[PDB]
């Protein structure tokens, strides 16, 4: 049963970055928040919920 | 058993309380229903005969094609079965393996032959008349509904002389002659 219920992927955050993601930081005080950055120079703040 | 949920079904794919492989698809029951056989072992006795015909047909096949023995025996086996009525045609030797079936032997049973001869409306109805002693083949009354009627004997199947059935036929056409009865 464990194998046929093993469905780890839940989804992806928005449309993602233009270029590869190289720096991810989690907010240690909030559960559903994340900060990411890409080689394009863009940094985003996500609402994981 | 209740309809199995999705997770139960995956863990119980092969469970089937009503159909097993050794049943061979319930070919037993199906042929019995169509021709209304009453003895549960009548199919398998017919099957064992059909197998033996098929075994000989193979052993003849493996013999070389031009062999006089092969041609002689195969022709004899075709004529014998055709005379019995099991085989409709004597042309092709492949019929011994393809068209030799239990249903072929069953169709020559007395209940079915009456139904084809229209002496009865249905096979079940025709079986009842045999058990009632209304049916004769030649001058001998027959109460066994498993009488296998050959092609030549199929001409002599008729109602009994004093049968109430025979009186209705003649009465319906206003041809009843009481001197005969």
């Amino acid at each position: 049963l464990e194998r046929m219920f093993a469905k780890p992927f839940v989804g992806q955050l928005g449309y993602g970055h233009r270029d590869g993601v190289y720096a991810i930081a989690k907010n240690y005080g909030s559960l559903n928040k994340l900060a990411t950055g890409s080689a394009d120079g863009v940094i985003k703040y996500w609402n994981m919920s | 058993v209740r309809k199995l949920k999705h997770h139960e079904q995956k863990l119980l794919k092969k469970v089937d309380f009503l159909e097993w492989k050794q049943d061979q698809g319930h070919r037993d029951t199906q042929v019995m229903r169509t021709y209304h056989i009453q003895n549960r072992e009548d199919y398998h006795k017919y099957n064992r005969i059909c197998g033996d015909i098929r075994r000989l047909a193979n052993k003849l096949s493996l013999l070389p094609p031009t062999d006089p023995f092969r041609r002689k025996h195969e022709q004899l086996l075709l004529d014998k079965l055709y005379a019995m009525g099991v085989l409709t045609t004597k042309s092709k030797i492949s019929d011994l393996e393809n068209k030799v079936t239990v249903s072929a032997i069953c169709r020559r049973r007395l209940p079915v032959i009456m139904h084809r001869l229209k002496m009865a409306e249905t096979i079940q109805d025709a079986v009842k008349f045999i058990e009632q002693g209304h049916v004769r083949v030649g001058p001998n009354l027959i109460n066994d509904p498993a009488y296998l009627v050959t092609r030549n004997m199929e001409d002599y199947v008729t109602w009994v002389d004093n049968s109430k059935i025979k009186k209705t036929l003649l009465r319906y056409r206003n041809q009843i002659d009481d001197f005969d009865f």
Binding site: - | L117, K118, M119, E121, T158, W159, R173
Partner: protein
């Protein structure tokens, strides 16, 4: 229509019965004859089938409907026009 004049495709008017024979009726044309020939063959085809069915009839054929049904002294089937009244029924009707 390619390389064909309109004059080529002119209706050819079709004649009539002579006056001397006018009593007998309409002069049949090929289309008229075809209707006759098909009609006769259609009937003859069915009539042939019925004769064959008579020849192959099994005298011993039994149907449970034979009790309700009745036949004529000529031998033809009798069928009720609509398909006896008890005295109590008649008294109410009267």
């Amino acid at each position: 229509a390619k390389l064909v004049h309109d004059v080529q495709k002119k209706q050819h008017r079709e004649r009539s019965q002579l006056t001397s024979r006018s009593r007998y009726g309409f002069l049949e044309k090929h289309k008229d004859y075809v209707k006759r020939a098909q009609d006769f063959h259609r009937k003859q085809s069915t009539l042939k089938v019925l004769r064959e069915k008579a020849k192959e009839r099994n005298p011993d054929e039994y149907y449970h409907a034979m009790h309700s049904r009745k036949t004529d002294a000529k031998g033809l089937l009798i069928s009720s026009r609509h398909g006896s009244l008890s005295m109590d029924q008649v008294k109410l009707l009267k």
